[PDB]
Design a binder for this molecule. Structure first.
Ligand SMILES: [K+]
Ligand SMILES: [K+]
Ligand SMILES: [K+]
Ligand SMILES: [K+]
Ligand SMILES: [K+]
Ligand SMILES: [K+]
Ligand SMILES: [K+]
Ligand SMILES: [K+]
Ligand SMILES: [K+]
Ligand SMILES: [K+]
Ligand SMILES: [K+]
Ligand SMILES: [Mg+2]
Ligand SMILES: [Mg+2]
Ligand SMILES: [Mg+2]
Ligand SMILES: [Mg+2]
Ligand SMILES: [Mg+2]
Ligand SMILES: [Mg+2]
Ligand SMILES: [Mg+2]
Ligand SMILES: [Mg+2]
Ligand SMILES: [Mg+2]
Ligand SMILES: [Mg+2]
Ligand SMILES: [Mg+2]
Ligand SMILES: [Mg+2]
Ligand SMILES: [Mg+2]
Ligand SMILES: [Mg+2]
Ligand SMILES: [Mg+2]
Ligand SMILES: [Mg+2]
Ligand SMILES: [Mg+2]
Ligand SMILES: [Mg+2]
Ligand SMILES: [Mg+2]
Ligand SMILES: [Mg+2]
Ligand SMILES: [Mg+2]
Ligand SMILES: [Mg+2]
Ligand SMILES: [Mg+2]
Ligand SMILES: [Mg+2]
Ligand SMILES: [Mg+2]
Ligand SMILES: [Mg+2]
Ligand SMILES: [Mg+2]
Ligand SMILES: [Mg+2]
Ligand SMILES: [Mg+2]
Ligand SMILES: [Mg+2]
Ligand SMILES: [Mg+2]
Ligand SMILES: [Mg+2]
Ligand SMILES: [Mg+2]
Ligand SMILES: [Mg+2]
Ligand SMILES: [Mg+2]
Ligand SMILES: [Mg+2]
Ligand SMILES: [Mg+2]
Ligand SMILES: [Mg+2]
Ligand SMILES: [Mg+2]
Ligand SMILES: [Mg+2]
Ligand SMILES: [Mg+2]
Ligand SMILES: [Mg+2]
Ligand SMILES: [Mg+2]
Ligand SMILES: [Mg+2]
Ligand SMILES: [Mg+2]
Ligand SMILES: [Mg+2]
Ligand SMILES: [Mg+2]
Ligand SMILES: [Mg+2]
Ligand SMILES: [Mg+2]
Ligand SMILES: [Mg+2]
Ligand SMILES: [Mg+2]
Ligand SMILES: [Mg+2]
Ligand SMILES: [Zn+2]
Lengths: 116, 127, 103, 86, 50
RNA sequence: GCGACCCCAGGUCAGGCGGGACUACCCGCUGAGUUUAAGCAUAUAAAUAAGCGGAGGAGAAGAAACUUACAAGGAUUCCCC
RNA sequence: CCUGCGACGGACCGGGCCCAAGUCCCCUGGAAAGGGGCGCCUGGGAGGGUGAGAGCCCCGUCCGGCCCGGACCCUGUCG
RNA sequence: ACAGGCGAGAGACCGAUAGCGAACAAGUACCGCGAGGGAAAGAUGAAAAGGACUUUGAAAAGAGAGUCAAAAGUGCUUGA
RNA sequence: AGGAGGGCGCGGCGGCCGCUGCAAAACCCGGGGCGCGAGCCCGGGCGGAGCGGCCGUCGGUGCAGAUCUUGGUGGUAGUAGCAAAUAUUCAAAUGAGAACUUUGAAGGCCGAAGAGGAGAAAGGUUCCAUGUGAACGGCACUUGCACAUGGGUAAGCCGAUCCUAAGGGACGGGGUAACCCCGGCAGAUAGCGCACGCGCCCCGAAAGGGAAUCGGGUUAAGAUUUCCCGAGCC
RNA sequence: CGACUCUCGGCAACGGAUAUCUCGGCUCUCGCAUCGAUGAAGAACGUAGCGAAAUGCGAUACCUGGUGUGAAUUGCAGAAUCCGUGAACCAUCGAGUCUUUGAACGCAAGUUGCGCCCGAGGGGCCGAGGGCACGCCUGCCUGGGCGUCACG
């Protein structure tokens, strides 16, 4: 409820909220198999709240780990692209040429000209 | 005559786009004309219908009748107006659905985005 | 074969119908080629759009002995006699052809 | 015999369900799938049946990972920041 | 048979759930063309070859 | 015995690379017969179908151990002839 | 004889917002979007929707304007 | 170059035995041990306003009645 | 047989001229006509939204046949037929309805290498309860192996699982364009006990081999050793 | 007069042609270049208050999050929300989750079968969670052989 408030709460408070909503979804599943008419719609509301809390906890964990690792990065934290994009040469490697080619660009580059 | 290469004149494509439209697009498609007094006051011609708008029916068998929008059934392309009803064979009451292109809005429900929308549409219709 | 016709020679004994080339994209090819010419022209704004300078050569063989046309590039001997270094020539819009000779 | 009487046997199984494709085409004694050729690393597929090919390719199932590449390609696989807060 | 592999029992459970009548309220939806299940199977006909 | 090297062995050693999928186009191999010849064996079907592999947004080719016989031309590719 | 850094635009690609004019009178019809009368827009009379052949009921279309975001090459003036 | 993929535009093309096999929960139902084979099936009405109630009947239904411009009465436009 | 000319009809495209909710197309009619004819024109009805004629041009353009395709429908015809496995009867109940359901009584059959009681394959909910619109159960049904809604399968000891059989796969190596085909061809064999010592892969049997359970009770439906009671074992 | 058969018309049947349509097909043209051991395509099983399928998703399961828009979704019912950090079977995407499998990777496989190692957290025990395939490259560690030597 109110993910903005969830982002304020600390990790101990967030896991305490997670425990409460799990106990409360269980009490509803007991109600669902016995009898009720308006406790059934609480299932959707509370199941989504459990997802909401776990999303916030997870997003905080990854942001913390991304800060703590900015040497080698863990495999799940690495930039995920297509497999072919990851195998590409860097711009430094793509733009590297040897001396005999760097000289000709220094001495004889293409000029800007016009015909009268 | 249309000039845009990116706009399709295909009747099959236009009917598919109209009928397979998401909810947020049906809101623009389900727009209503403003009344003469409201058009003069706001300098806008047409607005998307909303719940709790006051409306007058100007076409059909309920032409002339007034009420407030109690339902916007976007899935059926109809709005329901207060006390515009019919009796069934069993005597019960059912709201009659009217297309919003056959009504005029007489009173507008304005929260904060209705005013902002009215400002945007006025400027083009004012210049 | 029944009358006084030519002897027929139709080269249609293979699967020629899997190798039919139509030309319904001909007006689209013309527009794509035109668009690239305008893009290339803007990429080199003052440089001439017709490419580098070409020499004059005689078309080979006795049928075309007497006709002149554009060659590939200027000989290394022609550039030297005009004072243009062979490394400078391509950069200022002149084509170089080290294969050709002046007889 | 040879007919109704011989059709009565029908007690053993040549094929069971396949681990890889789920058809009842896994020859138990051969230990090979007759549809996909499961133990082989590559999938069994032949150009003399374009109907058999079209019945199982990319699109006949659900692409859990693909179907998102065109959307990630449009954004240049940005994979970086998030939209600025409202 | 009584002797079942787990994978066979799991598939048999799914086929048991799938042969039910369609809910009545499905026929009341706005643009509905569904009439019956079109995929009901009776055990005595139409065997599932497992 | 201490050492230098060579060849090789074992590692859940540190960091990395490969295998599969897709078929319209493209690169490599392998390879029929129906058919036509009014029979049929060379020939044709066809350096095609099928079969086994390899890529990309294009691929392959490409800067003369090339043509010609001309007053000679001048990488590759594609179109017309 | 010849030989790096930045600032501000352009051009390319995408996204969004706004952008003309009757629902006037009569008749028939369940319904006018039909017929008759009087009018208006048009760089918009492509198309579609709406209770019957709708330029002016609605979405759009035309001519434009405004804003947001990429691409890190290519190029136009400055230091 | 491009009968694949993602995204656009168009047509002197077909109009539900046609056009792709598939306009629809179609490579589906179903068939074969298997490799494989492979359909049929679109259209109430502007709006469900989808026929209350009386009576007969075990029921299904009928006869009255009601809605609709129309019974067009849920495989329902027309209906050889 | 065959050729040719001039016409009739179908569907588009470019043009021209029109019709239609005061009722278009299609369809129907012992309606009226025109044309030798292909055909056309009008009338009445149904139907409820589109259609026509002329010039030019174009085409998936005209059916009685093909043991033609798909779909529908006749006569045959209320006909052929429903005849193996000895067999039913009475009273009552229930029900709208009973030759066929239930109870009781009687008469018979299977005759224990059964028409009895339980399993392996195979099936997959058919098992049990309650209920019943139609369909189905080739007569019928109140009834069900049908249909609808629910319920139901409990293990340290029963099995699988463990071992190997015929056999199958397979590291290295060998062959092979590759797919793939070869396991004795020996390759530092990838490890085991207490530094020291030794050193001749997996899969394949619910009938083969094999750790350990008995009696009594219990449900609508389980337990022929799983639950309960008691008593043991590995 | 009647029955039967045949025939003509009217009405009713049977059947689904014709006509008018069409969120489909077919053909042509254009633009773009993006699958996978960071686990793809494909396969299985689950997942909703009422769902079987199709569609969607993955024990965070017809969805979580961000941004945009701005008051719905609806077959029934209940909840939430409205001059708002705010409805939606809405759009879009940068943050997340993502069961069993499958090239599929501890060994297998008509088996949810048979192993080994580490390990939060509460000597030993119980752990949540996770590793252990093959080929190859660079570097590294531990080694083997009088193969080539040098000095002892
Ligand atoms: K001739
Ligand atoms: K072409
Ligand atoms: K219109
Ligand atoms: K078909
Ligand atoms: K009708
Ligand atoms: K014509
Ligand atoms: K056990
Ligand atoms: K055994
Ligand atoms: K008659
Ligand atoms: K038709
Ligand atoms: K085993
Ligand atoms: Mg040929
Ligand atoms: Mg035989
Ligand atoms: Mg066998
Ligand atoms: Mg085997
Ligand atoms: Mg059977
Ligand atoms: Mg390592
Ligand atoms: Mg590959
Ligand atoms: Mg011959
Ligand atoms: Mg012959
Ligand atoms: Mg012969
Ligand atoms: Mg081939
Ligand atoms: Mg690629
Ligand atoms: Mg190349
Ligand atoms: Mg050279
Ligand atoms: Mg040449
Ligand atoms: Mg406007
Ligand atoms: Mg007028
Ligand atoms: Mg009408
Ligand atoms: Mg393409
Ligand atoms: Mg069809
Ligand atoms: Mg037709
Ligand atoms: Mg089958
Ligand atoms: Mg059979
Ligand atoms: Mg109509
Ligand atoms: Mg009808
Ligand atoms: Mg008649
Ligand atoms: Mg005509
Ligand atoms: Mg045609
Ligand atoms: Mg024909
Ligand atoms: Mg015929
Ligand atoms: Mg004939
Ligand atoms: Mg016949
Ligand atoms: Mg037939
Ligand atoms: Mg007959
Ligand atoms: Mg008889
Ligand atoms: Mg008989
Ligand atoms: Mg009897
Ligand atoms: Mg006897
Ligand atoms: Mg006896
Ligand atoms: Mg029994
Ligand atoms: Mg029973
Ligand atoms: Mg019967
Ligand atoms: Mg049943
Ligand atoms: Mg045992
Ligand atoms: Mg063993
Ligand atoms: Mg053996
Ligand atoms: Mg090998
Ligand atoms: Mg074993
Ligand atoms: Mg045994
Ligand atoms: Mg029992
Ligand atoms: Mg969905
Ligand atoms: Mg595996
Ligand atoms: Zn398989």
């Amino acid at each position: 409820v109110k993910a903005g408030e969830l982002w304020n709460k600390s990790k101990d408070d967030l896991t305490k909220q997670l425990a409460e909503l799990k106990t409360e979804l269980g009490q509803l599943r007991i109600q669902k198999v016995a009898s009720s008419g308006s406790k059934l719609n609480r299932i959707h509301d509370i199941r989504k709240s459990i997802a909401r809390v776990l999303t916030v906890i997870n997003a905080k964990q990854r942001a913390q780990l991304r800060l703590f690792y900015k040497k080698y990065a863990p495999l799940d934290l690495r930039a995920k692209q297509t497999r072919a994009i990851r195998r590409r040469l860097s711009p430094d490697e793509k733009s590297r040429v040897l001396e005999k080619t760097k000289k000709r660009t220094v001495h004889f580059p293409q000029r800007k000209f016009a015909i009268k | 005559m249309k000039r845009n290469p990116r706009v399709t004149s295909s009747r099959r494509k236009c009917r598919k786009a109209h009928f397979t439209a998401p909810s947020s697009v049906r809101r623009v498609l389900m727009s209503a004309a403003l009344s003469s007094e409201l058009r003069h006051k706001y300098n806008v011609r047409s607005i998307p219908i909303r719940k709790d708008d006051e409306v007058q029916v100007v076409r059909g068998t309920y032409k002339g009748r007034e009420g407030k929008v109690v339902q916007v059934y976007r899935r059926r392309w109809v709005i329901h107006v207060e006390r515009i009803t019919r009796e069934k064979v069993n005597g019960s009451t059912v709201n009659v659905g009217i297309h919003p292109s056959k009504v005029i809005v007489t009173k507008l429900k304005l929260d904060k985005d209705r005013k902002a929308l009215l400002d945007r549409k006025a400027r083009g219709r004012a210049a | 074969v029944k009358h006084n016709n030519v002897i027929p020679n139709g080269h249609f004994k293979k699967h020629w119908q899997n190798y039919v080339k139509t030309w319904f994209n001909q007006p689209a090819r013309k527009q794509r080629r035109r668009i690239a010419r305008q893009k290339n022209a803007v990429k080199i704004f003052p440089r001439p759009t017709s490419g580098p300078l070409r020499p004059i050569v005689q078309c080979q063989t006795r049928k075309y002995n007497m006709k002149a046309r554009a060659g590939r590039g200027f000989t290394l001997e022609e550039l030297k006699s005009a004072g243009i270094p062979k490394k400078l020539a391509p950069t200022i819009g002149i084509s170089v052809d080290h294969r050709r000779k002046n007889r | 015999t040879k007919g109704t009487g011989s059709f009565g046997k029908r007690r053993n199984k040549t094929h069971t369900l396949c681990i890889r494709c789920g058809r009842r085409s896994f020859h138990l004694q051969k230990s090979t799938c007759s549809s996909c050729g499961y133990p082989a690393a590559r999938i069994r597929k032949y150009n003399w049946s374009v109907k058999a090919i079209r019945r199982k390719t990319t699109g006949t199932g659900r692409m859990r990972y693909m179907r998102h590449v065109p959307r990630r390609f449009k954004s240049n696989f940005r994979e970086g920041t998030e939209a600025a807060p409202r | 048979p009584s002797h079942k592999t787990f994978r066979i029992k799991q598939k048999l459970a799914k086929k048991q759930r799938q042969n039910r009548p369609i809910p009545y309220w499905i026929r009341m939806r706005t643009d509905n063309t569904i009439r019956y299940n079109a995929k009901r199977r009776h055990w005595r006909r139409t065997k599932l070859g497992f």
